[PDB]
Amino acid sequence: IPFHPYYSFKDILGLTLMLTPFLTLALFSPNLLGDPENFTPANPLVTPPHIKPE
Amino acid sequence: ATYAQTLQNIPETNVTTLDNGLRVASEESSQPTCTVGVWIGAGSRYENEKNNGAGYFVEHLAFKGTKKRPCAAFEKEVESMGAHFNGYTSREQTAFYIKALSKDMPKVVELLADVVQNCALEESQIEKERGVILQELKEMDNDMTNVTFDYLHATAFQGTALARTVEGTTENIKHLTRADLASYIDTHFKAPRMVLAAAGGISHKELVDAARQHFSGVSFTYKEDAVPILPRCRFTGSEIRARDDALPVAHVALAVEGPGWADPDNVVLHVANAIIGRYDRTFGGGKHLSSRLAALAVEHKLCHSFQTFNTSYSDTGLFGFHFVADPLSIDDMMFCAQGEWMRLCTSTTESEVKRAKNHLRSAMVAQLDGTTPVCETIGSHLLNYGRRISLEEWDSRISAVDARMVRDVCSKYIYDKCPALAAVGPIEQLLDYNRIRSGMYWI
Numbered sequence: 378i379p380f381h382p383y384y385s386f387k388d389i390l391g392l393t394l395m396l397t398p399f400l401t402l403a404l405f406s407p408n409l410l411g412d413p414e415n416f417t418p419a420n421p422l423v424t425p426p427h428i429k430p431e
Numbered sequence: 432a433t434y435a436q437t438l439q440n441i442p443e444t445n446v447t448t449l450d451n452g453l454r455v456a457s458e459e460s461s462q463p464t465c466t467v468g469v470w471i472g473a474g475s476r477y478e479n480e481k482n483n484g485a486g487y488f489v490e491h492l493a494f495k496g497t498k499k500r501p502c503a504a505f506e507k508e509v510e511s512m513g514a515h516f517n518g519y520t521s522r523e524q525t526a527f528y529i530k531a532l533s534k535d536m537p538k539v540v541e542l543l544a545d546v547v548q549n550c551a552l553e554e555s556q557i558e559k560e561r562g563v564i565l566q567e568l569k570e571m572d573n574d575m576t577n578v579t580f581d582y583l584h585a586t587a588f589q590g591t592a593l594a595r596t597v598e599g600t601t602e603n604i605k606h607l608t609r610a611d612l613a614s615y616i617d618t619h620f621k622a623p624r625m626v627l628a629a630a631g632g633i634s635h636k637e638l639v640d641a642a643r644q645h646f647s648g649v650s651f652t653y654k655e656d657a658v659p660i661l662p663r664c665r666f667t668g669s670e671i672r673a674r675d676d677a678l679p680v681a682h683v684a685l686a687v688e689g690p691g692w693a694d695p696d697n698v699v700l701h702v703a704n705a706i707i708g709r710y711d712r713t714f715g716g717g718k719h720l721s722s723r724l725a726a727l728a729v730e731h732k733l734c735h736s737f738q739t740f741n742t743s744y745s746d747t748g749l750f751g752f753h754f755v756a757d758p759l760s761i762d763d764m765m766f767c768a769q770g771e772w773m774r775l776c777t778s779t780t781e782s783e784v785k786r787a788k789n790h791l792r793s794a795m796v797a798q799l800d801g802t803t804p805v806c807e808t809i810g811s812h813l814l815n816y817g818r819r820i821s822l823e824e825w826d827s828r829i830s831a832v833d834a835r836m837v838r839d840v841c842s843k844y845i846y847d848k849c850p851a852l853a854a855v856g857p858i859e860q861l862l863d864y865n866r867i868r869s870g871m872y873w874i
Binding site: 378379381383 | 863865866
């Protein structure tokens with residue numbers, strides 16, 4: 378089937394579904410997925426005791 | 432002696448009705464030869480699911496002899512007077528007519544009457560014709576154009592009676608009973624619904640006296656005098672794709688519900704179909720043809736042919752086009768076609784309608800090129816339009832049409848409408864109803 382309108386329409390719908398959680402997270406719980414340890418400027422002499430990768 | 436005048440000179444078509452309901456009409460010419468026939472208002476649309484194919488099976492017997500004059504008796508009598516008998520059966524109109532010497536005008540009417548009324552229906556012949564019709568189906572099935580229009584109706588009028596073929600089902604043909612053919616005749620071939628028409632060197636009066644004589648149907652109750660009104664057929668934006676990559680070319684037909692005989696717009700619709708016209712690989716015109724679609728078709732080898740059409744019916748109709756192409760140019764062709772349709776609704780030019788109107792009048796005239804065609808117009812006019820419509824009138828109506836009118840009317844019936852589609856053959860390239868549905872707007 379032609380990509381348009383079948384998947385162009387499906388894709389737009391898909392985008393809007395991903396968009397909600399992404400924006401909900403972004404607007405409501407901004408640092409949810411982020412480490413709070415990174416609000417402390419780099420200190421070349423001290424590695425945080427609790428250091429985990431993204 | 433300007434055209435205008437030759438029109439208002441053509442003798443008027445006379446019509447007289449009998450007490451039974453039969454309507455006799457004719458156009459008298461000096462012609463030594465002539466044509467007379469009975470145009471019944473019956474067809475496959477009147478048939479229901481159990482007898483689909485009766486009117487066609489019956490068509491195959493109205494010539495194999497009557498009660499009075501059996502097979503040879505009939506044929507002999509007719510062949511020997513140098514007359515040609517023949518007819519047809521559409522979805523909602525059936526006809527039987529003869530081509531004989533104006534001299535035999537009255538004996539023919541007798542013969543016509545004897546056919547519509549006393550068909551022998553020899554149960555022996557029936558079983559033979561059964562095998563014949565079955566055979567003609569095998570053949571007609573190889574006529575893409577037919578297959579394609581039947582299918583067109585099959586889906587455009589899906590669920591209704593208009594979605595049936597005239598020839599009927601393979602089962603009905605295999606099982607219809609003498610009795611079925613019998614009642615079909617009794618129920619439909621009835622005076623108030625038939626029309627005895629004639630054209631040529633014939634006296635209308637002589638014609639009607641002969642009518643009185645053999646077309647002496649009797650009517651006691653009101654029921655008999657009444658003409659039934661068929662149930663309305665529902666149009667449906669849909670499509671049916673019968674694919675077979677083994678056929679050489681592919682057929683495609685697209686259409687929208689048309690108004691119906693009665694509606695004046697039809698004139699405008701015809702003028703429009705007159706612009707887009709029709710084409711075919713043997714049209715000398717070539718790249719210079721006036722119809723853009725045709726021209727485009729030629730410049731891009733888009734199709735072996737295409738043709739517009741406005742098939743009218745009592746209450747409905749089909750306004751569309753059909754084209755035959757190669758598997759790989761179906762899309763470009765469809766594209767261009769809808770293109771012109773959209774152009775019809777949005778930008779028809781006065782110059783176009785001018786040409787269109789002329790071309791139309793010319794076709795209108797060719798519709799009356801002989802006693803038979805003329806006759807066919809009478810039988811049908813009365814049957815459809817109720818009365819007769821003179822070229823002087825048609826011509827009048829046609830002249831009223833102008834660009835603006837074409838656009839308005841076409842927009843009215845085309846723009847943003849869900850079309851009916853039928854495609855047959857190696858149709859992989861043409862595709863998606865949606866993509867086609869969007870071709871219905873802006874253009």
